[PDB]
Amino acid sequence: VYADSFVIRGDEVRQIAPGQTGNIADYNYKLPDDFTGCVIAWNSNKLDS
């Protein structure tokens, strides 16, 4: 298993899932259609912002 760490906007959480496309989904990070597993997202407004 591999782990990838990054922080994105709230509006871009829907494009992370494989099969979707977008400005961040096509130029920053992409996932294969046969992706196995799941991603975990939690708010960092307290810490990052």
């Binding site: 509006d11 829907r14 979707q20 496309t21 977008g22």
Partner: protein, 49 residues
């Protein structure tokens, strides 16, 4: 202005080429799904009306 739901309006689009790139650029897109088509393949399709 947008008309009310009980008085929903309707506009006819024909004899023109529409680009969906100028549409997807809108940031606050939250609810967006398609039944008979796929959003990723809407830039290479033709419609009678």
């Amino acid at each position: 202005r947008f008309a009310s739901v009980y008085a929903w309006n309707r506009k006819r689009i024909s004899n023109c080429v529409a680009d969906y790139s100028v549409l997807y650029n809108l940031a606050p897109f939250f609810t967006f799904k398609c039944y008979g088509v796929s959003p990723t393949k809407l830039n290479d399709l033709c419609f009678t009306n």
